[PDB]
Amino acid sequence: APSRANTKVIVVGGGGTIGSSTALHLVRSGYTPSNVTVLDAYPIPSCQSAGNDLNKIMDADADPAADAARQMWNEDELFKKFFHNTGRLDCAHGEKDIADLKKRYQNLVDWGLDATVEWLDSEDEILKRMPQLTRDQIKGWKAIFSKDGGWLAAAKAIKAIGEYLRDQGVRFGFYGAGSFKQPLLAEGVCIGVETVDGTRYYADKVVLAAGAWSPTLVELQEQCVSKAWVYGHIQLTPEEAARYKNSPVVYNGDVGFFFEPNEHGIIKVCDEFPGFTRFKMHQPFGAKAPKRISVPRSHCKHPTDTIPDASIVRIRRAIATFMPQFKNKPLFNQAMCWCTDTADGHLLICEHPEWKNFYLATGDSGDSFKLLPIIGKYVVELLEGTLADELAHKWRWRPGSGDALKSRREAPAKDLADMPGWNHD
Ligand SMILES: *Cc1cc2c(cc1C)nc1c(=O)[nH]c(=O)nc-1n2C[C@H](O)[C@H](O)[C@H](O)COP(=O)(O)OP(=O)(O)OC[C@H]1O[C@@H](n2cnc3c(N)ncnc32)[C@H](O)[C@@H]1O
């Protein structure tokens, strides 16, 4: 077995979140960069990566991995400039949701010494934090304001990792040269990969970090089920955008959520719902015949696609609620953004059970962008046999462990076949 410095690694989906983090940690840990090969369907930051976004939410999760990531977002010189510590305002209306919000302000006294949070008990209190909100729209609302957290400039952070890797001498292959087709196997050991154009790459270890594409590329036995979420954007004038500078992330689980305008004056608005599948017949490597599997419908591959009409209605309601003064702005650059759910919502980070030296690093479950800085550390630990037992178990190979179509969400995802308005072919 080669020394670390002579060990060759291929990261499939290295243009995305987990895959770029993995490449970075291989470099940071003392792998020789020219021994590391990033393969992606699209150049880093991949156009179709779920991390290719103006913004994501950084919450205040107590989990050890999330806390390790939060520290890096605050202190790591590669990542720090992309974390915007604006705070988050979580709003609720009606006795059911206000009951759950109250409960939750008590999970935080209990679980993680509060004082990093405020209860807001009236319209007046919320308006003091977020004065751009409309009083009559928030009649009867309560909120929790969390001081830590905020948002992450997601595309820029992956792009910064790519620039770092390029400058270190990491090898890249994109498009036909980067699109995984199959592993190369010799006597049950993975010795590299082949891409759709027939290019072969040989390495000691292969990481499959293909996000929502992972269950399309190899047979995962429904451990992961791929689903899309949706957003649109509105353009503010400089004067309008100035009013929202450093605004918290604003969220109401019955409505949706929105972010501070970017440096171009654009606000992204998002729905809140259990995701959409797009089932069709497909044959991953290792499947003996085609199967009905949820296969991403990639906005990058089909840039005339939008989102479902149902999704537009929901986003419009979010704008009518949160920003009634902007109800006439067109919602543009509507897109679907793919992730893959496990049954329990934990990652799938494990060696393949039959293909030695092939490792899965997926199962993102819609909440892993905030792990970008840290997650490749764990992947490297997996490759090196040093991953903590609890995590090796939590992230294990586990077909038959529950229905990922519902996962731990409120309902089984609906399918795009049944949701008109996104396909303009
Ligand atoms: C879609 C979404 C996700 C999301 C979010 C809102 C939306 C609409 N809000 C979040 C938030 O507020 N906070 C948070 O922490 N996360 C949030 N997310 C989730 C997050 O985006 C995802 O969990 C995470 O980014 C997933 O990362 P992963 O690395 O698993 O997936 P990826 O970034 O999409 O990268 C996969 C890459 O694989 C490449 N690919 C695909 N096919 C191939 C082949 N054949 N060969 C090689 N590479 C391939 C893709 O191109 C992509 O780069």
Numbering used by the authors: 2 to 426
What are the paper's exact sentences on this?
Fructosyl peptide oxidases (FPOX) are deglycating enzymes that find application as key enzymatic components in diabetes monitoring devices. The inability of wild type FPOXs to act on intact proteins is the most critical issue limiting both their diabetes detection efficiency and their protein deglycation potential. This is due to their buried active site and narrow access tunnel, as determined in multiple crystal structures. In that account, using a rational design approach involving a five-amino acid deletion at the entrance of the active site and a number of further mutations, we described a stable PnFPOX mutant (named L3-35A) that, relative to the wild type enzyme, features a significantly wider and shorter access tunnel.
In the present study, we set out to enhance the thermal stability of the L3-35A mutant by implementing a methodological approach whereby different thermal stabilization strategies are tested in parallel and their efficiency compared. These various strategies involved mutations to either improve the RMSF of the protein (generating mutants hereafter referred to as D-series mutants), increase the number of salt bridges (C-series mutants) or form disulfide bonds (X-series mutants). Our MD-based ranking led to the selection of six candidate mutants (C16, D02, X01, X02A, X04, and X07) for experimental production and characterization. On the other hand, the introduction of extensive surface charges and salt bridges (mutant C16) resulted in a further increase in Tm of ≈ 1.5 °C (Tm = 55.2 °C). Finally, the incorporation of a single disulfide bond in different positions on the L3-35A scaffold led to a significant improvement in thermal stability of all the tested mutants of this series: X01 (54.1 °C), X02 (60.0 °C), X04 (55.2 °C) and X07 (55.3 °C). In particular, we have shown that the introduction of a disulfide bond allowed us to produce a PnFPOX variant that shows remarkably higher thermal stability compared to the other mutants. Based on our thermostability results, we selected the X02A variant for its high Tm, high expression yield, and detectable activity toward glycated amino acids and we set out to increase its activity toward larger substrates (i.e., fVH and F6P). The activity toward these substrates was present in the wild type enzyme PnFPOX but was lost in the L3-35A design. In this process, while the amino acids that are directly involved in the catalytic function were not modified, some tunnel-lining residues were replaced. This could explain the reduced activity of both the L3-35A enzyme previously reported and its thermally-stabilized mutants described so far (D02, C16, X01, X02A, X04, X07). Hence, we set out to design mutations to enhance the catalytic activity of X02A, the most thermally-stable mutant of our library.
